[PDB]
């Protein structure tokens, strides 16, 4: 199938027409998305088949064809870009300064941008274009606004 590095849409034909359920990152021959997007199911890429390799519901991440490859981290100071891939709309970079999710196990960056749920899996980038995490697992605040964790996996 298609194995070029880049950001990809995750689609289904189970519902009405073709529906975008999420987004993912192809890097080093491995497809990276959020667990809630595919529920661990196999994917199709033209004539090719992508099988799940690693996943964890609590981290809300899954890799296909190989182990998780993304290891860049937010520096805790600088602005970043959400490379948003919204349903039926063109890929768009949005620059923002992340906030923080404070948890009993440590702090994590958080991006406060409003996009439909089908945008889950869009990559968050540092100034050198390295993927520091995926957008799409977070919380809804008072006004109905959305704040996503910067969710990053471990490169073994």
């Amino acid at each position: 199938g298609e194995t070029t590095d880049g950001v990809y849409r995750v689609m289904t034909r189970r519902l009405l027409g073709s529906t975008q359920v999420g987004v993912g990152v192809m890097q080093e021959g491995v497809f990276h998305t959020m667990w809630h997007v595919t529920k661990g199911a196999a994917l199709r890429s033209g004539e090719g088949r992508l099988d799940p390799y690693w996943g964890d519901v609590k981290q809300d991440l899954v890799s296909y064809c190989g182990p998780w490859k993304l290891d860049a981290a937010w520096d805790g100071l600088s602005e970043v870009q959400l490379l948003a891939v919204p349903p039926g709309e063109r890929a768009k970079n949005i620059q923002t300064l992340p906030g923080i999710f404070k948890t009993k196990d440590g702090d994590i960056g958080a991006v406060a941008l409003d996009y439909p749920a089908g945008t889950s899996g869009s990559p968050i980038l540092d100034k050198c274009g390295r993927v520091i995490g995926l957008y799409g697992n977070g919380v809804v605040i008072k006004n109905g606004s959305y704040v996503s964790a910067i969710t990053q996996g471990k490169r073994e």
């Binding site: 298609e2 070029t4 590095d5 880049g6 950001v7 990809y8 849409r9 995750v10 689609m11 289904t12 034909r13 993912g24 890097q27 497809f31 667990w35 809630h36 199911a41 196999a42 994917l43 199709r44 890429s45 992508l50 519901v57 609590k58 981290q59 809300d60 602005e79 870009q81 490379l83 891939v85 063109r90 970079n93 949005i94 620059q95 923002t96 300064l97 992340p98 906030g99 923080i100 999710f101 404070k102 948890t103 009993k104 196990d105 958080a110 406060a112 941008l113 990559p123 980038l125 540092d126 100034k127 050198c128 274009g129 993927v131 697992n137 977070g138 919380v139 605040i141 704040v147 964790a149």
Partner: protein, 39 residues
């Protein structure tokens, strides 16, 4: 059956639209991977 379609290159864009705030939130992460607000 789910399928993938290429949507673009992963690059930082100079002079991208700059927006969004930076809240400091107290949150909890459950066994199901769901975040919730703690107060």
């Amino acid at each position: 059956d789910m399928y993938i379609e290429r949507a673009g290159d992963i690059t930082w864009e100079k002079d991208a639209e700059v927006t969004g705030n930076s809240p400091r939130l107290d949150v909890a992460l459950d066994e199901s991977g769901d975040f919730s607000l703690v107060e």
